Design a protein around this ligand. Structure first.
Ligand SMILES: *[B]([O])([O])[C]([C][C][C][C]C([N])=[N])[N]C(=O)[C]1[C][C][C]N1C(=O)[C]([C]C1=[C][C]=[C][C]=[C]1)[N]C([C])=O
Lengths: 249, 26, 7
């Protein structure tokens, strides 16, 4: 996160850390959607062009964390993965179209003050909220500049109009994505950065006071570059795939 | 279910330091 | 790495 701030304790009870065993290091962010399911970006586990292809034995999930490097003794819960599901049409060959994956924890975790699931959006929620001008929130332990924080960072960013998004990159944008960030003429700044991938872009419903996960940190060219925007996976659009795997398994 | 309701905030009727920012954009 | 050993 660039130009963000330290999160308050229990600000994102659904934030998860993707952590590898050997070497022990931070893979990506993610989110708790239920007692047994974690949502992340597919490129966190699979990315051939870089020889990245993690299996369940390769990772561990750390939930209820605040401190990046600290083993938070009676606070965090570490889980082993049972199985990983990548979207079958994830397009790592071109534009990271459908950058999403579901992770199944070996055992359900218990909720606490620090651990709590985020809501998945419904059609009307998505409709009301995913509007240019509307601010969402991204959190992560990623890089501070295009070094690393000691604590989870947060930044609120406005949804940008589709055309503007398209005009900022050479990359082929799809309906499964949306871009967010400030425009060069707004004075405020901020963005996700490396280490933030898989993390959540959330909005607070003014209807029911609930937090909904609208996007997943996907891609962007650099961090907080002027005239550039971060790209996110449109969760609602992939909701049927989600619903699909859960019911299925 | 009980999703999107944080124990240390919503459940206690406490607002985080910058959520007002989001809501005011809606 | 910068990381504190996990149980
Ligand atoms: B993630 O793994 O942490 C990372 C960072 C997301 C934050 C970016 C932002 N909002 N400023 N995402 C990536 O590294 C992805 C994965 C592979 C390449 N990639 C990129 O973002 C590329 C551009 C790209 C987009 C779509 C398809 C292929 C490449 N960006 C850079 C700077 O190389």
């Amino acid at each position: 996160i660039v130009e963000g701030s330290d999160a308050e304790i229990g600000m994102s009870p659904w934030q998860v850390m993707l952590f590898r065993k050997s070497p022990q290091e931070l893979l990506c962010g993610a989110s708790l959607i239920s007692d047994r399911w974690v949502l992340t970006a597919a490129h966190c586990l699979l990315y051939p062009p870089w020889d990245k292809n993690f299996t369940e034995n390769d990772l561990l999930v750390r939930i209820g964390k605040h401190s990046r490097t600290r083993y938070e003794r009676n606070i965090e819960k570490i889980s082993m993965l049972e199985k990983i599901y990548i979207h079958p049409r994830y397009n790592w060959r071109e534009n990271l179209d459908r950058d999403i994956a579901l992770m199944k924890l070996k055992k359900p975790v218990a909720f606490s003050d620090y651990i709590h699931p985020v809501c998945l959006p419904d059609r009307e929620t998505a409709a009301s909220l995913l509007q240019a001008g509307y601010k969402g929130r991204v959190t992560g332990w990623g890089n501070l500049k295009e070094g690393q924080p000691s604590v989870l960072q947060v930044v609120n960013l406005p949804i940008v109009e589709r055309p503007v998004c398209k005009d900022s990159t050479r990359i082929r944008i799809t309906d499964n994505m949306f871009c967010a960030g400030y425009k060069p003429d707004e004075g405020k700044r901020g963005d996700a950065c490396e280490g933030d991938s898989g993390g959540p872009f959330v909005m607070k419903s003014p209807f029911n006071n609930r937090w909904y996960q609208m996007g997943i940190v996907s891609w962007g060219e650099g961090c907080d570059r002027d005239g550039k925007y971060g790209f996110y996976t449109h969760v609602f659009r992939l909701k049927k795939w989600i619903q699909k795997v859960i019911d299925q398994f | 279910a009980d999703c999107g309701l944080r124990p240390l905030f919503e459940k206690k009727s406490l607002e985080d330091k910058t959520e007002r920012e989001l809501l005011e954009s809606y | 790495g910068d990381f504190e050993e996990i149980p």
